[PDB]
Design a binder for these strands. Structure first.
Ligand SMILES: N[C@@H](CC(=O)O)C(=O)O
Ligand SMILES: [Mg+2]
Ligand SMILES: [Mg+2]
Ligand SMILES: [Mg+2]
Ligand SMILES: [Mg+2]
Ligand SMILES: [Mg+2]
Ligand SMILES: [Mg+2]
Ligand SMILES: [Mg+2]
Ligand SMILES: [Mg+2]
Ligand SMILES: [Mg+2]
Ligand SMILES: [Mg+2]
Ligand SMILES: [Mg+2]
Ligand SMILES: [Mg+2]
Ligand SMILES: [Mg+2]
Ligand SMILES: [Mg+2]
Ligand SMILES: [Mg+2]
Ligand SMILES: [Mg+2]
Ligand SMILES: [Mg+2]
Ligand SMILES: [Mg+2]
Ligand SMILES: [Mg+2]
Ligand SMILES: [Mg+2]
Lengths: 66, 116, 70, 153
RNA sequence: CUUGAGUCUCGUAGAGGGGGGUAGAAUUCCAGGUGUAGCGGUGAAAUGCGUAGAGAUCUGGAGGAAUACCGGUGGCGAAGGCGGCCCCCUGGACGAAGACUGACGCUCAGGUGCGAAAGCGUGGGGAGCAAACAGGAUUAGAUACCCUGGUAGUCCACGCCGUAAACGAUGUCGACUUGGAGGUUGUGCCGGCGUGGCUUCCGGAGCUAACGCGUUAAGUCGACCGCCUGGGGAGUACGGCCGCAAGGUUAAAACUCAAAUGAAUUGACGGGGGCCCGCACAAGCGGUGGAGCAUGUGGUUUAAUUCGAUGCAACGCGA
């Protein structure tokens, strides 16, 4: 488990932080469930909100078959 | 007529049939074979063995192009997904890649459920 | 599920890597679910029925540790 | 049956050639419990089969079995109301049982007069892939090829 | 007067709502390239599509509609409902520390508003799906189920309709009455110790006809409202009101029955599930059904063709 955003006192997940964001998407570009990454429900919503913002700016891929 | 030595095998594995198309890397189809055209009709057509025979004929059908290595793009849920890839390796192609390209809407309304 | 056949990997292990990579992505699970329209009423019932049984099995297993068979 | 409990029944070996294989052939040929009658037919066919190829009494019967023994057959099975014929590998003991049975029923429906000769002509025909038994073998094998797709439950 | 009710200050989470914009995937179609004989569909088929070049694959374009993953007996909303991302307008809930008002409250017939889907009107749009419809099957028949297509509709704007198993089949408000395990969202003090809101399951007393409910009560009580009085006839007729219509709403009676009903119990049954068995299948061998005759029966005939047995379990049976 160990939601790392609660342990590091995060306040926003900042879609620009691609190094952090790529740890929560699979090889095919899909958001990983909080049941797998142990993220707490509050930050998982911010995490998904951040990832969809980075996908729009092409900082992250929607799929692996682009 | 023309030599290539670098092809892509598109396996189209549906529940009812398997279509094997060997294209060149720019997508120009060199040859193709289907399970339905291999002498398998109806129930036989949807079998991994029939899809295997389809790959054997598509390897023969693109023989004069001298293809040495091949990429494998598998599309669809049908029984002849993995059956076709082993038959393409068995024919004598060196498989460079195996990728899934099955389309997923992120879409249109699917047809209504069958009441059988 | 993209697989690159790496250097000095036999085919059978490389093909096993492909089937495993496809199941993690759930491509076959997603395809079968999308071939027929699922009413919102039924997609919510199957969602509720899945949770209700996974909860009951968790409860009914825990008291199995509290009970002997012989 | 629903419970395996089928220890076979010892079978004495052919009195003349001491061949446990050939005793079963007599048993397959036998009618009405008339074993003495069947052994005479088998013995007079084997001598005729031997002196027609000169090989020997026993392995002339063995080389005919080779062309009749199946290696694969279909078993019935229904899936959606329709019947799926599933090819299945014949085990070694049943390969001999089918070979002997095919030869005898191939012989029985022949035009020769005496079954002794009538059998030897079939055992001779199978020696070069010509008779009805080898025809009945190739008919089984092609169906196991036509139905080869269904080799899984 | 301040405890009920409300106002203010700081923050929190949220698919709450209305407007606008935009992204990626996918389907379809259009044009072009490669290519050649099938594709599609089914339990199996056929209708259909294809040598006028399909399907497959690639390139570019058009268009509509829905937002995979996240996603969660998670969240928000009075309910109906609400899900990509961004902006604009806007509603509510909640928490901490106080300040303020000073019963300003609760409930609510009539009335007003909101209210899924289908449907109606006017004008757009139309990819996919798909009532109607057409064909192919299946079938004794098949106004179906299945297949191939396919129009209204589904989408947008504005208006109407006002009904749903609109369900927690559980009116709203307030108080009190053992616990356990979670979810979600604040907050205080030092992962621990508390304290609030909402929510899921289990369970005690109690209650219940039982099933079950059980601090989110179906427990113990108080305030107000709605509704019921056997089944059918019937939420029907007539009338009124409402609606463009479809219809909604309010709402009988004659007549008829002696029950209708709820919950649980024991069986039996299921084209429910699980586990077993049996010449039950499977694997084999020999028969019967054809022939002649023997024998029994049915029927017919007769003066009488004595009576009885007459699915399995009568018919070389009483005999
Ligand atoms: N896949 C998305 C939208 C597309 O399709 C959904 O299921 O709602
Ligand atoms: Mg369909
Ligand atoms: Mg009120
Ligand atoms: Mg009223
Ligand atoms: Mg509508
Ligand atoms: Mg309209
Ligand atoms: Mg119009
Ligand atoms: Mg249809
Ligand atoms: Mg009603
Ligand atoms: Mg409900
Ligand atoms: Mg009601
Ligand atoms: Mg309970
Ligand atoms: Mg009425
Ligand atoms: Mg009226
Ligand atoms: Mg049998
Ligand atoms: Mg007879
Ligand atoms: Mg009588
Ligand atoms: Mg009597
Ligand atoms: Mg009688
Ligand atoms: Mg009896
Ligand atoms: Mg008897």
């Amino acid at each position: 488990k160990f939601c790392r955003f609660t342990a590091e006192g995060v306040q926003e997940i900042d879609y620009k932080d691609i190094a952090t964001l790529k740890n929560y998407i699979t090889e095919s570009g899909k958001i990983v469930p909080s049941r797998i990454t142990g993220t707490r429900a509050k930050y998982q919503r911010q995490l998904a909100r951040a990832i969809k913002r980075a996908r729009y700016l092409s900082l992250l891929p929607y799929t692996d078959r682009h | 007529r023309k030599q290539v030595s670098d092809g892509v095998a598109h396996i189209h594995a549906s529940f009812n049939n398997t279509i094997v198309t060997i294209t060149d890397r720019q997508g120009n189809a060199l040859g193709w074979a289907t399970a339905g055209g291999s002498g398998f009709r109806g129930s036989r057509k949807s079998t991994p063995f029939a899809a295997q025979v389809a790959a054997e004929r598509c390897a023969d059908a693109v023989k004069e192009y001298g293809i040495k290595n091949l990429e494998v793009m598998v599309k669809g849920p049908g029984p002849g997904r993995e059956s076709t890839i082993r038959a393409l390796n068995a024919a004598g192609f060196r498989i460079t890649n195996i990728t899934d390209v099955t389309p997923i809407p992120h879409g249109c309304r699917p047809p209504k459920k069958r009441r059988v | 599920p993209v697989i690159k056949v790496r250097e000095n990997e036999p085919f059978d292990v490389a093909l096993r890597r492909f089937k495993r990579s496809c199941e993690k992505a759930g491509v076959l699970a997603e395809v079968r679910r999308r071939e027929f329209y699922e009413k919102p009423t039924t997609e919510r019932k199957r969602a509720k029925a899945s949770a209700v049984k996974r909860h009951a099995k968790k409860l009914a297993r825990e008291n199995a540790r509290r009970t002997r068979l012989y | 049956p629903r419970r395996r409990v089928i220890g076979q029944r010892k079978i004495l070996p052919d009195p003349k050639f001491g061949s446990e294989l050939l005793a079963k052939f007599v048993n397959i040929l036998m009618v009405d419990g008339k074993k003495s009658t069947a052994e005479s037919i088998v013995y007079s066919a084997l001598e005729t089969l031997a002196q027609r190829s000169g090989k020997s009494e026993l392995e002339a019967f063995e080389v005919a079995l080779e062309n009749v023994r199946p290696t694969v057959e279909v078993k019935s099975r229904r899936v959606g109301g329709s019947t799926y014929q599933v090819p299945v590998e014949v085990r070694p003991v049943r390969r001999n049982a089918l070979a002997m049975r095919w030869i005898v029923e191939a012989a029985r429906k022949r035009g020769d007069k005496s079954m002794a000769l009538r059998l030897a002509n079939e055992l001779s025909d199978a020696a070069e892939n010509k008779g009805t038994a080898v025809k009945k073998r190739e008919d089984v094998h092609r169906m196991a090829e036509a139905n080869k797709a269904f080799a899984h439950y």
